[PDB]
Amino acid sequence: IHIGAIFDESAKKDDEVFRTAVGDLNQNEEILQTEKITFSVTFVDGNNPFQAVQEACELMNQGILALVSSIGCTSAGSLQSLADAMHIPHLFIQRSTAGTPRSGCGLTRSNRNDDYTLSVRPPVYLHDVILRVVTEYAWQKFIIFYDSEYDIRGIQEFLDKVSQQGMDVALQKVENNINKMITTLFDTMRIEELNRYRDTLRRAILVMNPATAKSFITEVVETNLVAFDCHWIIINEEINDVDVQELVRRSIGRLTIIRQTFPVPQNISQRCFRGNHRISSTLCDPKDPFAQNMEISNLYIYDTVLLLANAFHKKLEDRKWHSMASLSCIRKNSKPWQGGRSMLETIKKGGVSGLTGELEFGENGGNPNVHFEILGTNYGEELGRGVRKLGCWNPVTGLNGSLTDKKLENNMRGVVLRVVTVLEEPFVMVSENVLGKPKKYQGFSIDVLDALSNYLGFNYEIYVAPDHKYGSPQEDGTWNGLVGELVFKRAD
Amino acid sequence: QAVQEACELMNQGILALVSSIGCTSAGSLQSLADAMHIPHLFIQRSTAGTPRSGCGLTRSNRNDDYTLSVRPPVYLHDVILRVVTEYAWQKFIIFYDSEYDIRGIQEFLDKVSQQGMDVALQKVENNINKMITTLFDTMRIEELNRY
DSSP B72-94: PPP-HHHHHHHHHHHHT-SEEEE
Could you tell me if B58 lies within 8 Å of chain A, comparing CB atoms?
yes
Picking from A164, A220, A218, A166, the residue whose alpha carbon sits closest to that of residue A197 is: A220
Under 8 Å CB-to-CB from A333, ≥6 apart: which residues?
Answer: none
Q: Measure in Å the smallest separation between the Cα of B114 and chain A Cα atoms.
A: 8
CA distance between the termini of chain B: 47
Q: Which residue of B has its CA nearest to A182?
A: B114
Could you tell me if A98 lies within 8 Å of chain B, comparing CB atoms?
no
Query: Out of B34, B56, B93, whose CB is closest to A48?
Result: B34
Asked whether the beta carbons of A46 and A52 are under 8 A apart, the reply is yes
Task: Give me the half-sphere count of Cα atoms (radius 13 Å) on the Cβ side of residue A320.
Answer: 16
Picking from A284, A318, A364, the residue whose alpha carbon sits closest to that of residue A21 is: A284
Under 8 Å CB-to-CB from A362, ≥6 apart: which residues?
Answer: A348, A349, A368
Compute the distance between CA of residue A126 and CA of residue A123 in angstroms, rounded to an integer.
Answer: 9
Compute the distance between CA of residue A236 and CA of residue A210 in angstroms, rounded to an integer.
Answer: 8
CB atoms A74 and B91 under 8 Å: no
Beta-bridge mates of residue A473: A479
CB atoms B58 and A97 under 8 Å: yes
A:124-143 residues touching chain B, CB 8 A cutoff: 141, 143
Q: Give the H/E segment covering residue A2.
A: strand A2-8
Q: Measure in Å the smallest separation between the Cα of A11 and chain B Cα atoms.
A: 16
| Cis previous bond, A426, omega within 30 | yes
Q: What is the DSSP letter of A366?
A: B
Picking from A258, A276, A239, A361, the residue whose alpha carbon sits closest to that of residue A311 is: A361
Residue A203: CB atoms within 10 A of its CB come to 23
Q: Which residue of A has its CA nearest to B109?
A: A171
Q: Measure in Å the smallest separation between the Cα of B76 and chain A Cα atoms.
A: 18
The experimental method is cryo-EM
Q: Which residue of A has its CA nearest to B102?
A: A153
Compute the distance between CA of residue A96 and CA of residue A118 in angstroms, rounded to an integer.
Answer: 17
Query: Out of B7, B103, B109, whose CB is closest to A172?
Result: B109
Task: Give me the half-sphere count of Cα atoms (radius 13 Å) on the Cβ side of residue A351.
Answer: 18
Could you tell me if A85 lies within 8 Å of chain B, comparing CB atoms?
yes
Query: Out of A49, A152, A160, whose CB is closest to B123?
Result: A160
DSSP alpha helix (H) spans, B16-146: 23-36, 76-87, 103-112, 128-131, 135-138, 141-146
Could you tell me if B20 lies within 8 Å of chain A, comparing CB atoms?
no
Compute the distance between CA of residue A139 and CA of residue A471 in angstroms, rounded to an integer.
Answer: 43
Under 8 Å CB-to-CB from B33, ≥6 apart: which residues?
Answer: B17, B39, B40, B66, B67
Q: Which residue of B has its CA nearest to A331?
A: B4
Q: Give the H/E segment covering residue B121.
A: strand B118-123
Burial readout A381-415 (b: 16 or more C-beta within 10 A, e: otherwise): eeeebeeeebebbbbeeeeeeebbeeeeeeeeeee
Could you tell me if B80 lies within 8 Å of chain A, comparing CB atoms?
no
Beta-bridge mates of residue A442: A429
A·B CB contacts under 8 A = 109
Under 8 Å CB-to-CB from A27, ≥6 apart: which residues?
Answer: none
Q: Measure in Å the smallest separation between the Cα of A201 and chain B Cα atoms.
A: 12
Q: Measure in Å the smallest separation between the Cα of A162 and chain B Cα atoms.
A: 9
Picking from A129, A99, A130, the residue whose alpha carbon sits closest to that of residue A204 is: A130
Beta-bridge mates of residue A374: A258, A391
Strand ranges (E), A365-406:
371-376, 388-394, 398-401
Residue numbers in A near B22 (CB within 8 A)? 108
Compute the distance between CA of residue A204 and CA of residue A226 in angstroms, rounded to an integer.
Answer: 10
SS3 letters across A163-223:
HCCCCCCEEEECCCCHHHHHHHHHHHCCHHHHHHHHHHCCEEEEECCHHHHHHHHHHHHHC
Q: Which residue of B has its CA nearest to A73?
A: B58
Picking from B42, B4, B40, B35, the residue whose alpha carbon sits closest to that of residue B21 is: B42
Under 8 Å CB-to-CB from A380, ≥6 apart: which residues?
Answer: none
Under 8 Å CB-to-CB from B113, ≥6 apart: which residues?
Answer: A143, A170, A171, A172
Compute the distance between CA of residue A225 and CA of residue A230 in angstroms, rounded to an integer.
Answer: 10
Q: C-alpha distances in angstroms, B31 versus A110, B5, B37?
A: 19, 15, 9
SS3 A346: helix
Q: What is the DSSP letter of B48?
A: G
Residue type (1 letter), A355: L
Q: Are strands A388-394 and A371-376 parallel, antiparallel or unpaired?
A: antiparallel
Compute the distance between CA of residue A258 and CA of residue A238 in angstroms, rounded to an integer.
Answer: 10
Angle at A49 between CA A149 and CA B55, to 5 degrees: 45
Q: Give the H/E segment covering residue A340.
A: helix A338-347
Compute the distance between CA of residue A458 and CA of residue A484 in angstroms, rounded to an integer.
Answer: 23
Query: Out of B1, B31, B107, whose CB is closest to A48?
Result: B31
- Given CA atoms A436, A440, A445, A451 in this order, what sign does their dihedral have? positive
Q: Are strands A357-360 and A351-354 parallel, antiparallel or unpaired?
A: antiparallel
Query: Out of A150, A168, A173, whose CB is closest to B119?
Result: A168
- Given CA atoms A183, A189, A191, A196 in this order, what sign does their dihedral have? negative
Q: C-alpha distances in angstroms, A480 versus A42, A92, A425, B28, B107?
A: 86, 75, 21, 76, 52
Asked whether the beta carbons of A133 and A391 are under 8 A apart, the reply is no
CB atoms A151 and B103 under 8 Å: yes
SS3 B41: strand
CB atoms B3 and A45 under 8 Å: no
CB atoms B57 and A45 under 8 Å: no
Could you tell me if A162 lies within 8 Å of chain B, comparing CB atoms?
yes
SS3 A29: coil
Q: What is the DSSP letter of A147?
A: -
Mutate to test the interface with B, among A94, A148, A172, A181 (most CBs of B within 10 A): A172
Q: Which residue of A has its CA nearest to B122?
A: A160
Asked whether the beta carbons of A84 and A109 are under 8 A apart, the reply is yes
Query: Out of B60, B103, B121, whose CB is closest to A159?
Result: B121
Length of chain A: 492
Could you tell me if A59 lies within 8 Å of chain B, comparing CB atoms?
no
Query: Out of B3, B23, B120, whose CB is closest to A50?
Result: B3
Compute the distance between CA of residue A149 and CA of residue A99 in angstroms, rounded to an integer.
Answer: 9
Compute the distance between CA of residue B42 and CA of residue B37 in angstroms, rounded to an integer.
Answer: 15
Residue A166: CB atoms within 10 A of its CB come to 11
Angle at A224 between CA A221 and CA A225, to 5 degrees: 100
Compute the distance between CA of residue A284 and CA of residue A282 in angstroms, rounded to an integer.
Answer: 6
Report the interhelical angle of A73-86 vs B23-36 (nearest 10°). 100
Could you tell me if B85 lies within 8 Å of chain A, comparing CB atoms?
no
Compute the distance between CA of residue A184 and CA of residue A422 in angstroms, rounded to an integer.
Answer: 41
Burial readout A170-189 (b: 16 or more C-beta within 10 A, e: otherwise): bbbbbeeebeebbeebeeee
Residue type (1 letter), A424: E
Could you tell me if B45 lies within 8 Å of chain A, comparing CB atoms?
no
CB atoms B117 and A172 under 8 Å: no
Report phi then psi at A397, rounded to 5: -125, -5
